[PDB]
Each structure stands twice: as structure tokens, then as C-alpha cells.
């Protein structure tokens, strides 16, 4: 899907700056210019306000989806959350950052549920998606004629659409309706609807209006930034049907921003009537206003708020694993862009004529080319500044601060420098979000960030050809090196950046294959096994027994056991080392499933490394509880009724003639322990000879055993294997490990682990007989929160 | 003396300029461009080549040096060391990196004694300093004529005094000679002479003569490298006598380069004979070429070996102490410094006429302002640079990066910039080594830093006057903001520059007195305990005494007791923590004692520490050696005539009837103790109840005790306090430590330590006893090395 779907993305965008170069034909770059200084201050502002409203409208928008969720926010919660997916989600899509993972980021602090804020994501999505339609049919259906002259096609062909679309959605109105579960409800504002297979959860009828009242507003809000910025307008009903086409156009076409789709729509139904020039400015001024300017503003506030939270919440924050990395691989990104297209457009005559005499001219040359190769980089190291590197992060700060140099000795571009060194202000800020420090050269390829740069090289090259239109071309051109040669310049450049992507990205792509996964040998066991005693954690055990992959850090102070079942990798437990090590662990999980194509899952993870989770692109989904007894407050002079009961079963245990004993590793029974193992049905001598091992005796023969893992440090300790026979008594099984209690309460063990209960009821009971503090395990998956998915699943089980 | 020597040194330096101001009356800074231009290329070539010569024999001259103090280094060492301390140690001077911190921290990785190595650096001055007097006195005696009509005395003055002078060199040798001592002689090329009080270190004849040698060539060199920039020339003897008076007063004069006293003195001897422009070019360029090159190629280097090291030793380098610091302190210094010259300077009329297109024209005077503002705190900044903070990496390398931009908005100081960028990106290379977290804000006032601050603001202003004499002053010139004024923009960054160092200076000084030394409260002693048990170092046990102060880190895990005798500090040990820790907490003793006014001294420290101890200015000095005896390698069955005589002590103790008993903390025979510690007659119950007190008994009685120091690991354990009776046997103490090492053996320590001998031969013999291992212990003190001190000290021993 990957593949293709990317591939099909780029074809879509290529094919739309081709129509877009096609619809532009009649217009020089001199035209759009005087068109860019024609539109009135009056206009702008209303352009801006209408902006303005319509990012508020989004904010009801957001609310709706929390309503329909059952999540309950605070306002100025619901409010950044709003703007902040919106804005961003709006312009690159897909691409880097995207709505969902911007809110459940966001919505993960203050404990919303993941499935929740999956259920607000896909709301916040479908409703203007299924409402789309709606809206562009009773457009349509205010003044046809104007509709049909704007479309160029048959009055009753369009007619009859509109009213066909009206009347289906009226009819799977009415066909869910129809299949409505009274009595119980998830939410104040939802239905639970059945089919046969499987129970849909949708919006209320109230809810339902409302989402379209606040749809409708916001489309018409967009609609009327463009709207202001056309010096001469059409009708407003046909103007607002063929903007409504064109944003779906955008969406379908799967372009990040929706750009060139979008525009070579508007500019395809408007091309005659309104004017190229007009439009076309129209519509660069609409695309930096009500896009561009609100992901600045988002990514700003996102910033700040980062900023904010380390300055004030020094302690707290250790490993930092928050939004400035995703933020400036964006700005750094677009750093890039601005590079790139600065390169593929001329220069003011004036300014070269003045920088002549302060500069050799042969040096404006040599600058003009390695700004746009700085350019192609900054678009490919954006990626190593999302994986967290440290050298990254160096790497990019000067080349933006090399690429605003050249920026000025190129053609004292003060625009160009300017942007690049805020750019680079903001990066500095935030040197400690860069954290690891793995090796640029070892980073997994990603299509997607190839893919985008070759997009934006794309986009560079119809710019280049739009903006130097006046020259004649001519194999000469290559090797004019003047001052007033402009096209040669765009030309050099152009070749550079493309030579330079297409190198890298084969040089990327043709490299060496990941070595095969193989379980650990003794040697790695050993290791493992010093780093278990030398930590607080002692589930790691379970890695010893050699039947799963060991993952090692750098520093071999930590490691992180994992095993591939199908097209996934599961990691068994969180990495067991240090806190700085466990994230560096993590993010080289996620590398290594990256370089294997594979699917990073992690199984039964704490709460503590939730947020390291979510940095990787995971979501926690709630797997079971885990019990573990505190041995401070825990004494056998207390009381209760559960308390009564143990001590009841521990005195009758003893009065019966059990008894219990403790063995170091090495020296087991094991010529027992076979036996009651055979007696019950990994059971391996390597795997037991690693810890001590408690049996309890019936009048003197062995009637259970278990193993204990534990650490160096006093800190915890638990059981993984534990058999007991069924001719055995049923008290007998809870005498021993209250007898494991006691030893752990006698040793001073601050803490005791008994084991998980997912989602099993008479466990959980069992384990309730104690007395214990639950505690929450997760599980770590990616977020497959596409819509089309869930509408084509919602299509399917309607049909 | 240090604020009397600052405030004469001062003195001196600006009366030198008011003088040189005097000398170049007649030529204008038009009439010395000219006479830079007019110096032709063979010539320059010639002083380049006279300067590699000359740098080349101060090698030679390392050599005698190493040869005197009987040290045996490589050649590239001896290289690299006569290099750098020599080109560093003649620019900057004493202001920041010394010759003898240069040869100190080089010349310590070879295992070179501190005592060797200041013998080193004494040999090194004074052999040019009292070799001064000689050379001058014999270049005056060859055409006496010459002479007279240079200096402008009579003839039969001057001969009479270079008589006098060489007489009393001779009767001084022949003085030093007869109280030549025979037979012992420290190094193969030296003598010891004797005079009564103290024994003096002389080289030898040959020694002496070889040295006498170089020191000729070198100067010769040197004055030559000023000879070859003169277009019309004077007799060479006459020129020769000049120079080397003018080197004399200002190596007198204690101005860190010789600057100004230097040229005030060639100058008022040749302003007629050789004309202004002239002899002002060459003097200008030979401070270029003979001076500030090789500081430039010196600091280079050491930046380049310390590149290298941490490049190729990635594992054994861990908290850095090197040269980077104090070297990038020195780069920021003379970009502050270039900064402030640059706008003193009128800028070019071309450039400006240019950039004027390009920018506002009063952004060129905002920006010319903010420069020299930057350069002030560039002077400042150097300080916090060479004291490792990153607060002043960052504020640095920011200031760097405007003052470098704002050198291109100015009047497109392209060469200003490029230094300042070549600055930035050598400062940004190594941002490891700047690791302190401290506030600037807490930086300690230096005097020396604050002087030379106001010795660079004095110079530029020197250079105002001189740049912009063509222009008629007035009270209007302030308020002037055109393009073409040049003087208003020099006088305008001038009482800037003034004043914020004015501010700041008076900001610093005037600043809040530090709180007292106090004795630790119950909190601190607990908190400090707390730390020794989570720790390695046993010795910390001597804090808890509660009669010493402790300093703590910020992170609260280490540690750091002193104590304030007479006008120093004596910390007693290395303090108590991870390097890291250990790193921060021995610059902020630094710190600590630089407020309060004393000299910070380090008592008993181990070797692994003393780069730190380099790196705060200190030296190590052979105090004592440490005995601790190894549990691994010890066993009770191994063969010795010691280890015989061991068994046959215990066995034999054993059948008299001595028995030891280990009481834990809280559970001691206080009255006991209390009469054991009169009978022997600090001791406390308070500082008794901190640890386990073994207590040897004869016959029931007890015969002695002794506490023992001990953390919560088995890695090492001591003993501190250790009282026997005069009546018990000889043997009962000796098996008691055997009865120790037994225990520590049977709870299996890695190792334990008997205690220091300083330098007690029956102390040293008694500890070798057991066989121990021996590790030196040091003495850290502050560098006293002043060459007028010890030629004081010479003088006064001789007369
Ligand atoms: C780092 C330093 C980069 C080079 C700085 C400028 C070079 C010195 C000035 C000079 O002579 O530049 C020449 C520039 O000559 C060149 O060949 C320029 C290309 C070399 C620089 C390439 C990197 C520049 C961008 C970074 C101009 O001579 P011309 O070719 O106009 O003479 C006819
Ligand atoms: C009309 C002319 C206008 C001139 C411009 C005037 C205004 C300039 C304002 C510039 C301020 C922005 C820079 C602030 C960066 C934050 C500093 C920082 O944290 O730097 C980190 C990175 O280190 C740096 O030094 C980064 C330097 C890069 C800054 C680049 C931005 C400035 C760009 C200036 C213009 C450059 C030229 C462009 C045109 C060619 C170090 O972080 P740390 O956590 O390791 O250290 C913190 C310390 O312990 C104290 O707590
Ligand atoms: C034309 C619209 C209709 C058809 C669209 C379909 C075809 C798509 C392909 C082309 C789309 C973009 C074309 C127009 C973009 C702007 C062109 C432009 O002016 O580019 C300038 C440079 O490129 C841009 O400005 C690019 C703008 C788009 C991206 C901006 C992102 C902003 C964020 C950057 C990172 C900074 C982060 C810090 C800020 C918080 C260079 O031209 P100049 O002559 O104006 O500049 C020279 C001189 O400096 C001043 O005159
Ligand atoms: C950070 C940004 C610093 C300022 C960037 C330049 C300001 C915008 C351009 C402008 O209009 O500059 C004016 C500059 O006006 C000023 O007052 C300049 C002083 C403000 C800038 C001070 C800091 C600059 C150096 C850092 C020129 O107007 P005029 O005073 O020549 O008109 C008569
Ligand atoms: C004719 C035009 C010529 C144009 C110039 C072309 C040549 C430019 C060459 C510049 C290269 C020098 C910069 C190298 C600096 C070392 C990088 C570094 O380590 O930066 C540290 C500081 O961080 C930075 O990002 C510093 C950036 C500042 C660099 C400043 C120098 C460049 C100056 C460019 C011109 C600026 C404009 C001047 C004029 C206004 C980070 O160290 P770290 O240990 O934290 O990270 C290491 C990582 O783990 C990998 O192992
Ligand atoms: C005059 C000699 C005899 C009398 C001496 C007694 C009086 C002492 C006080 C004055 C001493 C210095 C006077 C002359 C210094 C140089 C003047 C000069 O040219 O200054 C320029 C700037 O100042 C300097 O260059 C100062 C030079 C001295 C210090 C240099 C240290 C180098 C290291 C700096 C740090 C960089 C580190 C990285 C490099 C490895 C600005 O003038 P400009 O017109 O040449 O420049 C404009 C334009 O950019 C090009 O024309």
C-alpha cells in the first residue's frame, strides 16, 4: 500500500503542476506581481479576520468531537488541541506531523484514553469528509443555472446530482436510524447502532446538526478568505460549489498541504472569466493566509509551551521526549523550501547591481549553487531532527546559519537570512531535545521523506521554469557565469539539487542488508544476567531463558529482549537499565523495526515510559493490571478479614506438616523438579540454575516449587514458573507463596510482585485474597488511525 | 601588591600611549598606510623567515632548560612545549595562560615533578633577564660613537657604564665560583654553591656559555626581524643597544605583551634619524609578525592536540580539562579586542557608499554601536570561558555570531567577520569542554580581567584620536547621524564602550559579601553520612567529626570538607562522589576561596584528580606515600619471612590469650573508651557512634580499640583513630590490624588501608611489615612562580 499509495501522491502532484503550468500559459510572472500588489489593505484584513474566524469555528469543532467521545477537557485544553491539529494537520497532512498525533500527545497528559482520542480523531475527520458532499449539493442547488455555467455542464444533469445526493443521504439517514439500540448509550451525545456483524457508534441527532452547522460555517469562513482576495467575483453559490470540489479534489488526491490540486481546480473552473493573474494571486495569497500563517502560529505555540514546561518544570523533566522535535524538523523542512525556491526565482537588479562591487562575481555564482545544495540537505536531515540525533541536530544549526550566509552573498536575499537564522535560533533553543547519539549514516530510509523532497525539487523546477520565461533557452546557457544572468543561475542550481537528491537517495537505498535476528549466546546471557542483578527490575529474567533476541546499548549497561512472531517484533518488558538508557533503547527498537520492516509492539509496558512510547509512535492501550503487595505496610500481627483468612490458612498449613525451603542456584533438586514438572504437564536446567528456588514439602516429600526472580538490590522481587500438583491440597498452594511473603518481609524486600490479570475472574480473586496495589500495564502499538480505512470498514458493514 | 602592581601597571601602560601619541604627532594614519604599502615583499619575506628562525632557537633554548633541571622528555614534547610556552607566554603574558602553566600542563603527562618543572621555567626567564645587561653592555662597546649618538649621552658615559657592567658580571661569577661545593652535583650540568643560610642551583660553565649563546642568536633574531622592515637603517650595534633596553623596559614594566612601552621607546630613540611613518609601520608590523602570529599558530596547535585527543582517546577523556578552555578564552579576548579597534577605525568610503543601497542608513549606525557594546563583553565573557561555564560557551558563541554579522552591516568588515566566524566555529567544536552549570552571575570579581578590560578600551580610544584627527571636534559631532560622518560613529561607540564596562565592573564589585564559614549543623553531618555510605571513599568517615566545614553540590551527591587556617583553605581529601561531581565541586572550592580571599589548598590527594587540580591553577607536590594492603592476593597459608613473622605474631597472641570483638554503631562500652582514651592522654560519643569499633581485649580486659571507617560497599576500609596502653605487649597492637585484616578479609573487602607515611622510618617500616601496595599521596598548592621573587631571593642570598 506504502508503495504505490506514495507512488500514485507523487503522480497525482506531478500531474497537477503540469495543469497548473497549462492554465498559466497567458500570464507572466510580472502580471501576477502587479496582481500580488493590486489586491486592497481592506481586503487583507478581511482576508485575515475571515482567517481568524474560521480557526475559531474549529475550536466548536474540537468540542463537538469531545461531546461524541464522552472525553471531558478543560477548555483552554480543548482550545490549543483544537488549533494546534487543525493547523497543523491542514498543512503537511500526512507527511510529518499529522492531527492524531498532535492530540494524543497533547490529550495523553491530562490521562484521556488512547481509543478515546482515536474515537475524537476519526470524527474530527469524517464529519467534514461526509458533510463535504452534502454542502457542495445544496450549493449546487441554489441558482443551478449559475452552477451549471460555472461546471460547463447541462442544467438537469446537475439538477438531478444534487438531488440524488440529498436523497441518499437521506436514505442512510433514515437506514441507521432504523437500526437504533434504545436503552443504553456510550455517551450523553450517541447512538449504538447493530447490523449483524458488528455495533457502530455515531453522533445523536443534535449532535449530528450541530457538526453540520459548525461544517458549514467553517467551509464558508474558508471560502471567504479567497473570496475578498479576487478583485472581481462570480456568484457566491457556484464560487463556494467549485471550492468545495476542488478541497475534496486536495483531499482525495492525498497531497499533504492539497496544494496544486486544489489550485489547479479553482484555476481550471475560473481561468477565463475571472482573469489568470487575479486568481492565481488570489490563490498564493489564500494558500500563506488561511495554511501557512496558522502552522507558523501552531508551531510557535507548541514551542512556547515546550519552552515553557522546561523552564518552569526543571526536575520533572529529565529525558525530554515532548513536540519542539517533531515541531523543527518541520521548520527545518520548510527552511529547505524556502532555499530551494529562493534558488529557482531571479534576482532584484538592483540589489546585484550594489553587492557587485562589495563581492567578487564569480563568488554570487559559487553561493547562488551551494545554497540550493544546503537546501536539498536541510529537506533530508528534517528527518534525522525527528529521530531525536544529536548530530542532527549540530549538522543542521550550521548549515542554517551557513545557508543565511549565503543567502546574502547570493543576492542579499535579507528574506531568505532571516527566516533561515530564526530558524536556527529556535533550534539552538533546544539542544537537549537532541539527545541520542547514534550515527546519521545508520538512520532507516524512509519513501515518505524522499518522497517529499522530491515533491519539493519538483515544485523548484516548474517555479524555475515560471519565472524565467522571458529567456530564450539554449545549450550555451549552462556556462554563462554573469552577473546578469539570472536563468543560468536558476539552471546550475536546479541540476545541482537534483543530481544531489538522486544521489543520495540511491546511496541511501543501495546499502547494506541488516544482519539476521539469532538468540543470544552464552556470552550475551552472562551479560544479560549482570545487568539484571545490577538494576532494580527483576522481570528481565525471563531473558535468560535464551529463546528471545537481546538488544544491547552502546554503553552494555542496558538491554531490551524481543522476539518476531509474523510481521511484527514484540519487545517483552520495558529496557532494563537507567532512564537515559531506556529511551536510547527505545528509539534503537524502533530503528531496528524499521530497518527489518516490521512493526514495533511492546507487551506489558509500565506507565513510566508511556510518553517514550508515544515519542516512537506508539499508543498505550490498557492490558491488564498488574499486583504487587507493599511488604511495609504489610505485617502478620494485623487484622482483617482477608487478613484472618491467610493467617487462618498459614497456622492450619503448618499444623498439616508443610514445610518450606529455600535453595541457592546451582544446588536444586533437580531430579525433583523434572518430576513434578512431568507430574503437571521454558523448563530447562540453564534457565532454573540462574535463580533460587523455593519448594514446599508435604510431610517431608515435594509437593510444589517456583523460582524467584530477584536482584542484587532489595528493591523487588518476583515469580514467573510455579506448578503445583493436582493431588496436592488447595490451601496448600497459598501457604507457599505467603511463605514467600514472609521470607521477602524477613530479607526486607521493600516490594513484592504476585503477576498480571488481563482484560481470569477467579485469578483476580485470588490475587484479591492479598490485599495488593494494582497497577495498570500497557501495551505499546503503532496509531492506524487512517480515515478512509474506517469510512470503507463503515461503507462495508452498511452494505 | 597584586592591586598596587594592576594599578602601576596601568599607570605605566598609559603613559606609554600618552607618550606614543607625543611621537607620532607629526605623521597622520594616512602618511603610515602609505608606509605599511611601501615596505616591499622581500622584506616582509625576510621577517617571516628571521621569525622562524627565531622561534627555533627558543627550542634550543627549552632544551638547556630540561638539561639544567635534569629532565628527560622527547623531542617533540620538548618541541611543542618550547613552542607554546614561549609564543603564549610572550604575547599574553602573565594576563592569562602563563609559560609555566603551559609547561606544566604539557610536561605533567610525561611524569615530570612540579618541582622540576618550575626549576624549568625559572631557568627559562632569568637566563634571558640577567643575559639582558651583558648583551646590551657588549653592543654599546662595539662603536662607542654610535652608541653615545643613539642613546644621546656622552661617550665616555656610556663606555664607563657598559664597563662597569661587564666588571661586575665577572666579579659576580668569580663570587658564585668560589663557593662552588665539589662532589655532589643534582644533574650532570649544574653546581650547588654555598652561602650560609641556603643552597643554591647553578648551571655549569659550559652550561652557562651554550645558554649565554642562544640567548644571543635569539635576540639578534629578533631585533633582525624588526631590522629587515626599516627602509633606511642605522648602524646595527646602536640598533641593537636600542632594542634590547626597549625589551627591558617593557618586560619591566610588566605589560603583558610589552605593548606600548616597547614602541614608545624605539620611537623616541629614532623619531628624527628614521623618520615617523617608517619606523611606526615597522613597529606595527613587527608586533604582526614576531608576536601575534606565533600566539596564533601556538594556540592553534595545543587546539589541535586536544582535537586529536579526544578524537582518538573517546573512553579515557571523561569530564575534559585541557588547554581548549583557557586558549578559547584567549581567542574570545582578542575578538573582543578586534571588535573595539575595528570601531575606532573610520570605515571605507567604497564599501560604504555600497552598502548604503543595500541597508538603512542608520541601521549602519545601530549597528556600529551594538559592535562595540559586544566587544566589551566579549573582553568580559573571556573570564567565564576560561572558568568552564556553559552558560558563557552559549552567551559566547552567540555574541560571536551578531558581532559577526553585525561586521557586515557596519561598513562591511568582512575581515572582522571572518575572525569572529573562525572564532565561533573553533568555540562551537569544543562545547564539552566548557561542562560547569554554574551562574555567570556568580563569577568571582578579577581585578587582572577588569584591568585588562580597561587597558583595550584605553587603547581603542588611543586609536579614535589617532584615526580621526582630521576632523574638528564639537559638542554637535554626538548628534550627528549621516553616512559619510565617521567620527561621530567612533565617539559614539567609544562612551559606550566606556560606560558599560564602567557598569559592569562597578555591578560587580559592588556586590553582596558571602555568607561566613560555619560548622555543619545535625542535617548536614546526616546528609554528608548519607553520602559516605552510598559511596567508595571510606576517608569521608573524617567528616563527620562536625569540626570542619562541608560544601556541598547542587545535585546534593557529593561533597567537600574544608577548613580556613590562617589566609588559606585546606580541603582535607578529594571530594566525595562520581568525576562529574568531583569535577564541579573542586571548581567551585575554586570559587569558594576566590571570594572569600584565600589561597585554595588540597591536603592529601590521590593522583587520579591532579588534571583538575592543574586545571584550578594548582600544583602537586610528593607529600607522603599511602600504604594499602590488598585482600585478594592475601591468604594466611602463603610463605613470607614478613608473612612467617606475621603467623608466628598471631599464633602466639592467640595462646596468650587476646581476643577481638566488632561492636556495631550505637552497642560501645562507652565507659570503656572514655577510660582507654585517658589512659593513652578528636573524641566524641557523637563521632564514635558513626562506625563499627573493633575492641582487642587481653584476658577479658580490654587492652585496646580502634573505629573503623566503612561505606555500604566492600570496595575499601580504614582506620582513623587508634589508641593502645603503654603497658599492653608489643605484638597485641600488630595482631589487632592482622585481627582487622582477617575480618575484612572474612566479609571479603576488596581492599584496605593502613594509613600515610609522610615524606617516621619505624612508622614506614612498621606498615611494610604486611607488604603493603604504595600509592603517592599529594599536596595541591597555588603556582608562586615569579621570576623577580626568586631573582629578589638570589640577590639577597648573595649580598
Ligand atoms: C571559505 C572561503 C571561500 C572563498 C572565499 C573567496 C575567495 C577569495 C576571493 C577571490 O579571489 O574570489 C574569486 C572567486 O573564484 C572562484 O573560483 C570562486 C569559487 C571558490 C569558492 C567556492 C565556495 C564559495 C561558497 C561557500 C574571485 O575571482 P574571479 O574568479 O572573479 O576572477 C576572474
Ligand atoms: C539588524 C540586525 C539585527 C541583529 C540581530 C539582533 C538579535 C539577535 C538575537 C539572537 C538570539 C537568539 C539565540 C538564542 C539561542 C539560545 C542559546 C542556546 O541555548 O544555545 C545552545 C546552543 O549553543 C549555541 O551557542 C547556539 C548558537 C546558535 C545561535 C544562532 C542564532 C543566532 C543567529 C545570529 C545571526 C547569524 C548570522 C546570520 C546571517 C549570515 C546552548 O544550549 P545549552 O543548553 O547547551 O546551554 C545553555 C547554558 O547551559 C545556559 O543555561
Ligand atoms: C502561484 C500560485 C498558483 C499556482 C500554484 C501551483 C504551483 C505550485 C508550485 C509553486 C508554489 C510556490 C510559488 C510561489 C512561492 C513564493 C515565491 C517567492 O517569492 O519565493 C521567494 C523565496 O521563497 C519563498 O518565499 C517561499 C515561500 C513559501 C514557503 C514559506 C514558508 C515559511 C517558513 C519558513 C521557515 C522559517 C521558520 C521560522 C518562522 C517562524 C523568492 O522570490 P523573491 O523575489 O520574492 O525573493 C527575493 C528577495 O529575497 C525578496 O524579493
Ligand atoms: C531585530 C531587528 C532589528 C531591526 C531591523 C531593521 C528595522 C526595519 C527597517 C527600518 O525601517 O529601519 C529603520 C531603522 O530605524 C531605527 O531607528 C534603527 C534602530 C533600531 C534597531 C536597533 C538594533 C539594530 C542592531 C542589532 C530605518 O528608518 P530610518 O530611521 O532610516 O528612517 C528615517
Ligand atoms: C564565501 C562564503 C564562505 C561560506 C562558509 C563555508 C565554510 C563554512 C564551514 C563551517 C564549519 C565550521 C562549523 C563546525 C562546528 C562544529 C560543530 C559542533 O560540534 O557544534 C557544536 C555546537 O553546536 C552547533 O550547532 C554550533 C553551531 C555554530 C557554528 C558556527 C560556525 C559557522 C559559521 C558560519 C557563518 C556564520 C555567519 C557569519 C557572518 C554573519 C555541537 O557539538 P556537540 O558535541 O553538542 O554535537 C556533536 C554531535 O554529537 C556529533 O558528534
Ligand atoms: C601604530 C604602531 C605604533 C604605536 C603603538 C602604540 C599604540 C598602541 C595602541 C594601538 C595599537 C594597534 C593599532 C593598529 C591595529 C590595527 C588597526 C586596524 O587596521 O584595525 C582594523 C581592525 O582591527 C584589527 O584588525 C586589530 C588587529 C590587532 C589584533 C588582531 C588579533 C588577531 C586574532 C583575533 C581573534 C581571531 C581568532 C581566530 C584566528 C585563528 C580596522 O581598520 P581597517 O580599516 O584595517 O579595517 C576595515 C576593513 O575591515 C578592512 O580595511
Avoid at 528481565?540 to 517484533?569: V, W
Avoid at 482477608?642 to 542456584?665: C, I, S, V
Avoid at 490479570?757 to 492506524?784: H, M, S, T
Wanted: aromatic share 8%.
Amino acid at each position: 500500500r506504502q508503495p504505490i499509495g506514495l507512488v500514485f501522491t507523487l503522480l497525482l502532484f506531478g500531474l497537477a503542476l503540469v495543469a497548473c503550468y497549462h492554465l498559466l500559459r497567458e500570464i507572466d510572472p510580472g502580471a501576477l506581481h502587479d496582481a500580488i500588489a493590486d489586491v486592497p489593505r481592506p481586503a487583507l484584513l478581511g482576508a485575515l479576520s475571515a482567517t481568524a474566524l474560521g480557526f475559531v469555528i474549529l475550536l466548536g469543532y474540537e468540542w463537538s468531537a469531545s461531546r461524541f467521545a464522552g472525553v471531558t477537557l478543560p477548555m483552554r485544553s480543548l482550545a490549543t488541541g483544537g488549533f494546534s491539529a487543525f493547523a497543523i494537520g491542514n498543512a503537511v497532512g500526512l507527511s510529518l506531523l499529522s492531527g492524531g498525533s498532535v492530540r494524543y500527545r497533547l490529550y495523553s497528559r491530562h490521562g484521556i484514553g488512547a481509543a478515546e482520542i482515536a474515537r475524537m480523531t476519526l470524527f474530527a475527520s469524517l464529519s467534514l469528509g461526509c458533510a463535504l458532499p452534502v454542502l457542495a449539493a445544496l450549493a449546487a442547488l441554489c441558482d443551478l443555472d449559475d452552477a451549471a455555467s460555472a461546471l460547463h455542464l447541462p442544467r438537469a444533469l446537475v439538477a438531478v446530482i444534487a438531488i440524488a445526493v440529498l436523497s441518499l443521504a437521506v436514505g442512510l439517514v433514515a437506514f441507521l436510524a432504523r437500526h437504533r439500540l434504545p436503552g443504553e448509550r456510550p455517551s450523553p451525545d450517541s447512538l449504538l447502532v447493530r447490523l449483524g456483524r458488528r455495533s457502530l457508534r455515531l453522533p445523536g441527532l443534535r449532535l449530528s446538526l450541530l457538526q453540520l452547522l459548525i461544517t458549514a460555517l467553517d467551509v464558508a469562513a474558508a471560502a471567504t478568505v479567497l473570496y475578498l482576495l479576487l478583485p472581481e467575483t462570480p456568484p457566491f453559490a457556484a464560487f463556494l460549489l467549485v471550492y468545495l470540489l476542488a478541497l475534496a479534489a486536495g483531499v482525495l488526491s492525498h497531497v499533504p498541504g492539497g496544494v496544486g490540486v486544489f489550485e489547479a481546480v479553482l484555476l481550471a473552473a475560473f481561468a477565463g472569466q475571472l482573469g489568470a493573474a487575479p486568481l492565481a494571486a488570489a490563490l498564493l495569497l489564500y494558500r500563506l493566509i488561511y495554511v501557512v500563517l496558522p502552522l507558523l502560529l501552531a508551531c510557535l505555540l507548541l514551542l512556547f509551551l515546550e519552552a515553557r514546561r522546561l523552564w518552569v518544570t526543571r526536575q520533572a523533566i529529565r529525558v525530554a521526549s515532548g513536540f519542539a522535535a517533531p515541531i523543527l524538523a518541520i521548520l527545518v523542512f520548510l527552511s529547505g523550501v524556502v532555499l530551494l525556491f529562493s534558488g529557482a526565482t531571479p534576482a532584484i537588479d538592483t540589489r546585484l547591481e550594489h553587492l557587485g562591487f562589495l563581492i567578487p562575481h564569480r563568488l554570487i555564482d559559487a553561493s547562488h549553487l551551494v545554497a540550493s545544495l544546503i537546501g536539498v540537505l536541510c529537506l533530508l536531515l528534517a528527518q534525522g531532527l525527528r529521530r531525536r540525533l544529536s548530530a542532527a541536530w549540530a549538522l543542521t544549526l550550521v548549515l542554517l546559519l551557513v545557508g543565511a550566509l549565503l543567502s546574502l552573498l547570493k543576492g542579499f536575499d535579507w528574506e531568505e537570512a532571516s527566516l533561515l537564522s530564526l530558524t536556527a535560533a529556535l533550534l539552538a533553543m533546544f539542544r537537549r531535545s537532541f539527545y541520542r547519539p547514534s550515527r546519521l549514516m545508520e538512520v532507516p530510509f524512509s519513501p515518505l521523506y524522499v518522497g517529499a523532497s522530491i515533491c519539493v525539487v519538483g515544485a523548484s523546477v516548474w517555479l524555475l521554469l515560471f519565472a524565467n520565461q522571458d529567456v530564450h533557452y539554449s545549450n550555451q546557457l549552462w556556462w554563462q557565469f554573469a552577473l546578469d544572468a539570472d536563468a543560468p543561475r536558476a539552471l546550475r542550481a536546479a541540476l545541482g539539487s537534483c543530481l544531489l537528491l538522486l544521489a543520495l537517495a540511491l546511496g541511501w537505498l543501495l546499502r547494506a542488508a541488516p544482519p539476521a535476528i539469532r538468540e543470544p549466546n552464552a556470552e550475551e546471557l552472562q551479560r544479560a544476567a549482570r545487568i539484571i542483578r545490577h538494576s532494580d527490575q527483576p522481570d528481565g529474567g525471563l531473558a535468560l531463558t535464551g529463546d528471545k533476541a537481546l538488544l544491547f546499548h552502546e554503553s552494555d549497561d542496558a538491554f531490551l529482549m524481543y522476539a518476531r512472531r509474523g510481521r511484527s517484533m514484540i519487545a517483552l518488558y520495558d529496557p532494563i537499565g537507567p532512564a537515559m538508557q531506556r529511551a536510547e533503547l527505545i528509539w534503537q527498537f524502533r530503528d531496528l523495526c524499521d530497518l527489518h520492516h516490521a512493526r514495533p509492539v511492546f507487551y506489558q509496558v509500565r506507565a513510566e515510559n508511556l510518553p517514550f512510547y508515544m515519542d516512537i509512535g506508539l499508543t498505550a492501550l490498557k492490558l491488564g493490571e498488574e499486583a504487587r503487595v507493599d511488604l511495609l505496610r504489610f505485617d502478620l500481627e494485623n487484622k482483617g478479614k482477608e487478613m484472618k483468612d491467610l493467617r487462618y490458612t498459614w497456622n492450619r498449613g503448618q499444623r498439616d506438616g508443610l514445610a518450606l525451603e529455600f535453595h541457592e542456584p546451582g544446588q536444586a533438586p533437580l531430579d525433583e523438579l523434572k518430576a513434578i514438572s512431568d507430574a503437571w504437564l521454558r523448563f530447562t536446567p540453564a534457565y532454573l540454575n540462574f535463580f533460587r528456588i523455593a519448594i514446599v514439602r508435604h510431610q517431608g516429600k515435594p509437593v510444589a516449587f517456583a523460582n524467584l526472580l530477584e536482584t542484587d538490590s532489595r528493591e523487588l522481587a518476583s515469580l514467573d514458573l510455579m506448578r503445583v500438583h493436582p493431588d496436592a491440597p488447595k490451601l496448600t498452594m497459598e501457604f507457599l507463596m505467603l511463605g514467600l511473603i514472609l521470607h521477602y518481609k524477613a530479607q526486607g524486600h521493600a516490594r513484592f510482585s504476585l503477576g498480571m490479570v488481563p482484560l481470569f475472574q477467579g485469578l483476580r480473586r485470588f490475587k484479591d485474597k492479598f490485599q495488593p496495589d494494582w497497577e495498570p500495564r500497557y501495551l505499546a502499538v503503532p496509531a492506524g488511525l487512517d480515515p478512509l480505512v474506517a469510512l470503507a470498514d463503515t461503507a462495508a458493514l452498511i452494505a
